[PDB]
């Protein structure tokens with residue numbers, strides 16, 4: 001029985017990794033994720049310049065999940081490029097570097113510089129499309145013209161295999177259209193579904209108040225709230241993007257949730273809210289739990305069930 | 314008590330009602346909701362002709378909510394019109410009729426027949442926008458130009474105050490655009506936020522199978538999964554549509570949940586999944602619970618806290 005994966009010309013001990021933005025902002029965080037039993041890690045989404053992010057409180061968690069409006073606090077691209085180029089021990093596990101520029105030009109500028117490091121060290125790019133562009137326009141991945149522009153320019157500037165982090169969609173015509181855009185770009189080799197469910201609002205009944213300060217309390221939702229949304233997205237893209245990998249993210253707290261992701265088509269499985277809340281010890285639990293479900297069912301490898309979710313009639 | 318309230322020229326004993334599609338399809342269902350302690354009821358969304366709906370199983374519930382792909386099973390518009398004109402006892406509580414034709418023309422044909430019954434008896438129209446357009450296009454509310462057309466045509470054909478049932482949005486630019494469309498129609502006097510969160514996917518780990526038959530297991534989500542999404546939408550519309558009322562729907566299981574919807578801006582509060590699961594006795598529990606929260610806080614009216622959610626700093 002084994003959790004090993006080979007993909008993207010890397011080897012992974014298991015499919016688990018942090019979701020971007022969790023336990024991955026500082027050198028300390030990145031060393032901590034490396035020391036964990038995760039099969040990979042991804043760095044905090046970066047911008048060209050360091051950022052302080054939004055005013056606090058900007059993250060809160062609850063029994064059913066979390067809400068955030070972090071605002072891209074990060075140490076800046078040079079820091080993450082350095083971590084990838086000089087500090088990361090690739091004999092421990094593979095490294096993904098997430099980028100989230102606030103314009104197409106900013107993304108092009110970062111990927112041009114990443115490319116020689118990616119070629120030489122094997123760091124993998126995850127481009128975050130579930131982000132702001134022009135205020136008053138939708139996030140990039142909800143504006144299919146902007147999305148196409150971003151992927152054209154990044155493909156040209158990077159010239160190497162990469163992946164994309166996608167917001168959730170809620171409408172079959174949007175799945176159709178989004179996957180068709182992605183399928184224009186052969187360098188897009190993995191699709192991460194999903195980023196937070198956007199612009200939720202948590203209200204505390206005792207205080208009669210929202211729980212995060214930015215944006216009048218509106219923020220993206222993670223955790224138990226979003227598992228069926230995440231599974232739908234992983235399967236929708238798994239079905240529409242047969243020459244690409246799908247990584248699942250959203251609502252994983254247990255090996256059973258991970259099992260569901262993998263049945264829907266996930267290769268790697270990312271852990272956000274549950275990791276923020278429990279800490280990196282979660283990875284040993286998730287491994288043990290997933291192996292226990294496999295052993296009950298007689299599955300010996302991930303391939304033997306990945307994408308094999310059954311439909312009715 | 315009491316939680317009595319007046320709007321749209323009608324008087325309501327309390328803010329609670331069923332959500333469209335729950336306990337409202339048959340004469341039996343409608344008489345059951347009428348006999349309940351709810352302050353109002355709404356009929357199943359109808360089409361011109363009777364419909365069987367999609368294959369079963371098409372609804373499933375779980376501790377955190379529900380998933381459905383019902384496919385508009387209903388008795389047809391002639392039935393619901395007859396119920397509104399001849400059968401409903403308006404002395405018990407107000408009635409709303411939900412219309413969900415599959416084209417703009419179908420909606421126009423139904424509203425021109427409803428209009429005289431609305432004038433004579435006081436039935437209220439809820440137009441469901443969270444309904445399919447042409448297949449291969451997004452649902453109507455997700456296509457702003459189609460939405461505008463629907464509303465111009467209905468407004469013209471109907472000529473009386475009505476409301477609309479909206480899908481959730483997840484992007485502030487979308488809230489801006491959608492509210493601006495609705496505000497172009499002075500006959501749209503109430504906005505119901507929200508319909509189910511679209512196209513989720515629930516998988517059963519033991520059977521390794523999706524849990525509903527239509528659409529390869531994809532369906533709209535209701536219940537605990539969607540409460541922060543519902544609150545955000547209620548609040549976003551409440552803020553943007555100061556000359557309309559907002560009706561809250563999504564994730565109400567308790568008077569506390571209802572309390573949160575009203576803080577967010579809700580005038581009426583609709584109950585779907587929790588009503589499907591608990592039955593119509595839920596309305597006496599919700600009233601008791603809401604009045605207890607009120608008494609503990611010193612609130613004597615809903616108007617004292619409606620829309621008064623506090624932001625930070």
Ligand SMILES: Cc1cc2nc3c(=O)[nH]c(=O)nc-3n(C[C@H](O)[C@H](O)[C@H](O)COP(=O)(O)O)c2cc1C
Nearest residue numbers: 019020021045194195196222223250251271272273
């Ligand atoms: C505190 C916080 C920070 C996040 N930062 C980023 C980010 O920098 N880039 C990104 O792609 N996603 C970010 N996300 C989204 C997560 O990567 C993940 O997609 C989302 O939380 C859903 O997974 P979950 O249900 O396991 O939380 C962040 C989430 C949280 C809670």
Ligand SMILES: Cc1cc2nc3c(=O)[nH]c(=O)nc-3n(C[C@H](O)[C@H](O)[C@H](O)COP(=O)(O)O)c2cc1C
Nearest residue numbers: 332333334358507508509535536563564584585586
């Ligand atoms: C079985 C079922 C049938 C439904 N049918 C309709 C409908 O006919 N028209 C409508 O506007 N919404 C319909 N809905 C959506 C609900 O009215 C409601 O918006 C959604 O379930 C979210 O509320 P909840 O969290 O209380 O379930 C239906 C929901 C369910 C669960």
Ligand SMILES: CC(C)(C)OC(=O)N1CCc2cc(CCc3c(C(=O)O)[nH]c(=O)[nH]c3=O)ccc21
Nearest residue numbers: 045068069070071072073130131132195196220
């Ligand atoms: C640039 C400006 C307007 C300060 O941005 C923001 O207010 N936000 C709030 C949410 C957000 C998200 C992003 C993308 C990074 C990200 C974040 C994040 O850093 O807040 N949180 C997530 O859950 N997923 C993400 O992909 C960037 C900017 C902003």
Ligand SMILES: CC(C)(C)OC(=O)N1CCc2cc(CCc3c(C(=O)O)[nH]c(=O)[nH]c3=O)ccc21
Nearest residue numbers: 358381382383384385386443444445508509533
């Ligand atoms: C016309 C056709 C293709 C059979 O429709 C469908 O398969 N569906 C699946 C979901 C759906 C919804 C609607 C709108 C009525 C409705 C339904 C419903 O009847 O399925 N469920 C909800 O959660 N909200 C709704 O607003 C109409 C058609 C369809």
